[PDB]
Amino acid sequence: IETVPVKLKPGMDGPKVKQWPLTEEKIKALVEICTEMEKEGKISKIGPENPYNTPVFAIKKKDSTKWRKLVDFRELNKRTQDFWHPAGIKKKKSVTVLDVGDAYFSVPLDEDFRKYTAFTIPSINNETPGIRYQYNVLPQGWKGSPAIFQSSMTKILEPFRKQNPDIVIYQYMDDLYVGSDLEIGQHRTKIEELRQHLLRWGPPFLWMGYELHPDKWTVQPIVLPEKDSWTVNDIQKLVGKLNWASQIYPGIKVRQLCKLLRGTKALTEVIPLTEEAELELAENREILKEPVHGVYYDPSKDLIAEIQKQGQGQWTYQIYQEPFKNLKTGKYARTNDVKQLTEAVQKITTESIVIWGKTPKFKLPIQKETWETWWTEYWQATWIPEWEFVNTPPLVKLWYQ
Amino acid sequence: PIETVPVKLKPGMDGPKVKQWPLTEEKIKALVEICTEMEKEGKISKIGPENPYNTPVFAIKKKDSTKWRKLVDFRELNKRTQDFWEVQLGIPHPAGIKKKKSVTVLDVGDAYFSVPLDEDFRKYTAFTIPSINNETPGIRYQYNVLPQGWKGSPAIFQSSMTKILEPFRKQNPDIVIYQYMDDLYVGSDLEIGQHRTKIEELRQHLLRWGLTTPDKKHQKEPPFLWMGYELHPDKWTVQPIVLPEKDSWTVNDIQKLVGKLNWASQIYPGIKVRQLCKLLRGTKALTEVIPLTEEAELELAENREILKEPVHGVYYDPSKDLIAEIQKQGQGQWTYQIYQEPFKNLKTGKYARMRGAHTNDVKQLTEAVQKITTESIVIWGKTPKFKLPIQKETWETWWTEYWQATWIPEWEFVNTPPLVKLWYQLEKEPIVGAETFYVDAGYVTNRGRQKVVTLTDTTNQKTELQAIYLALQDSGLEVNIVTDSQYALGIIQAQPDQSESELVNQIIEQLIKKEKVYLAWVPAH
Ligand SMILES: Cc1ccnc2c1NC(=O)c1cccnc1N2C1CC1
């Protein structure tokens, strides 16, 4: 076929990323997979004259007993040239996510780019050199792929698009987001059909095979303890919380509360509240009832995502671009920490895609070595967000949920 | 006689054009004999003045032999040559290999010189042999095979190598080969003779490609002292380590000793160097002499005793499960050993890594488990079932309440003191009827009590901890403490049980003593 010439952003060179060591189980799965990808001429074994590399992992399909080869094209995607979103989707009632990755494989990759797609199948204890290949077709997870395949895509999709304009479809990387307002019964059917209408040309369900229901996504407002009797401690926590949130909602006043706190009283000493205090709380309580006004999504900025461990299998996240200027906040509850955490990330990323058609730069409350050790064990997405590791302040965790 | 690998110079770069050093007629003679020997063997060939590139050559004799040797300085060429895939820096660890019945080392003679060089690249490998007479110029050649000392040489070679074996390999699932630089380790479970025979088969397979190797009578025999270890086909150990019996030790000596001691720890359990390491504090010269302490010499002698008795690691038995067991050897020290069969060690090791200024055994213990896991996946592509001196309840407690997310694989509690526990727990709510201390280097209580102390040479962060220390000190068995320092709050809420800040440790002591303690934070002004 006619291969479109692709190129890296000016002056940039190809990825030379270390491959995190894998477990025998994974390795074997990858050998078996890539071996068949080779026979099909999808990929080809490469030589020493190729100094590039990208990490590879094997994830397990959701309710499927097969493996999926995952490739961390992050470094590459960042260095690839820029190739040149339905707000209605986020309102849809039902959205299903499919994996269209295999389409790409029908299209060849520009010969002079192929080398950058080099990756390696590692050997246990380095007992073996490690099997190296590069791609011949468009590789899954590479931002280039969707672009270069856009045209052929639109083509096999215009029928459905007009034969069913009541359905919204968005494509992000290897994923196809099919939205609608139909009854979950109707929806599932129309989804299946689309599947054969694609079989017609070039798709197991992604994300539990299951649905998503955007319409029901809501913001987690900052809350205040409502309680019967108030002790010095309670109030202290209160004021502390309040003061913090006053940097977001400046209308919050603590004046009266702070006054119930004059004197070095005993912590457990109950404090009946005054009239002014009562109203000050109420007013504050009222201010917090909704997200702060003004905050808007800036497409030219990085979408950041922070998570906090609450406990009891409960987590808190916030999506923003500028500190305190949250675009969304939420909650996640169940396993073990990591598993939970990954599920949080993925969940969160999906939302970001669905809403702002983009993936966020997470900040994870965990240790690299550990994360690098298990994340692949529960990961099911076809994409991989950028992430960094941090040390959550005990106060922040306190100020949420 | 194999596929040549395509090479290129780094972009926007021309081949090396560097002048040949003035040689000696004596050396010019040797070189011409060598380059002629070589041109008749095809590895090099005369070129026309067409070629403007040039690389410096020179003559050095063999070591302890009175025989000339050609050397080509490729620094420049290499500065210009494209990069290659990494000549694996990844080296197999003995505990990861399985026993064989027999094993064999096959040294590859004329390795590099048995492989072709990208023809379009040969020109860049130009060099010259000066003439002895003036207007009778000297010989220009270029490389046709792989020049030792060149960038790609090791890579390309190591590559081809594997390509060649791949075949033999496939029709010999039985046999195991590992290639390292110029040696080829080959073991099998074949009965003695059958083994010896298949080696030749191999030796031939290589022959078919001009790959010269040593015959049975000239090959190296087990064990194989491999970078740090002695490898018999069924057992291993470390490179024999005897401890000097000096009476005067230099800073450097001690450094070298510690290093050695370290190495040994991976297999020799109970090796300790805490005391010897102590000996370095304040040292001012690599040649300064430090006398031994009673604990240092005791330790030395104890290690010396440990080493005296040789140990031998066992090989990996993939059919079995690998068990990893961990112990707290000292404050901050942990020892572990992994095995498939009781006491039959694959590998051992210590863990002293302190991540953070303050920690607790649980956090620390956990971090060790991680270290181990990582290693395992690497040596065996699998993780071990752990044996741990801590009970779930303990773990769970700390876990659940720590702000960072964490995870430990399948683990079994082993009742092997010392057990790791939490020496104290902050109350989760204010203590009723417990005096309330308000701190900021001083405090005030609900009961009128107070003390504004004096601290000199104290840092902001350090002043805050002080007050709290004070509070703990004068209070009774139950206290509620209110502070504005998020720092201290943090430090303590993490319930450390060891810290290298003396103050902390003190406080820590206080905490352990108390019946119930509640810490609360409130803003500044
Ligand atoms: C250095 C080295 C690295 C990797 N594997 C091995 C060796 N050397 C051996 O001596 C060895 C010993 C026992 C079993 N396999 C061994 N071999 C395998 C190749 C037969």
From Swiss-Prot, chain B:
Changing residue 64 to S: Confers multi-NRTI resistance. Changing residue 64 to E: Confers multi-NRTI resistance. Changing residue 186 to I: Confers resistance to HBY 097. Changing residue 51 to D: Confers resistance to stavudine. Changing residue 103 to A: Confers resistance to nevirapine. Changing residue 330 to D: Confers resistance to abacavir, lamivudine and zidovudine. Changing residue 100 to E: Confers resistance to atevirdine. This is Reverse transcriptase/ribonuclease H. It comes from Human immunodeficiency virus type 1 group M subtype B (isolate HXB2) (HIV-1). The gene is gag-pol. The chain holds residues 591 to 1126 of 1435 of the full protein.
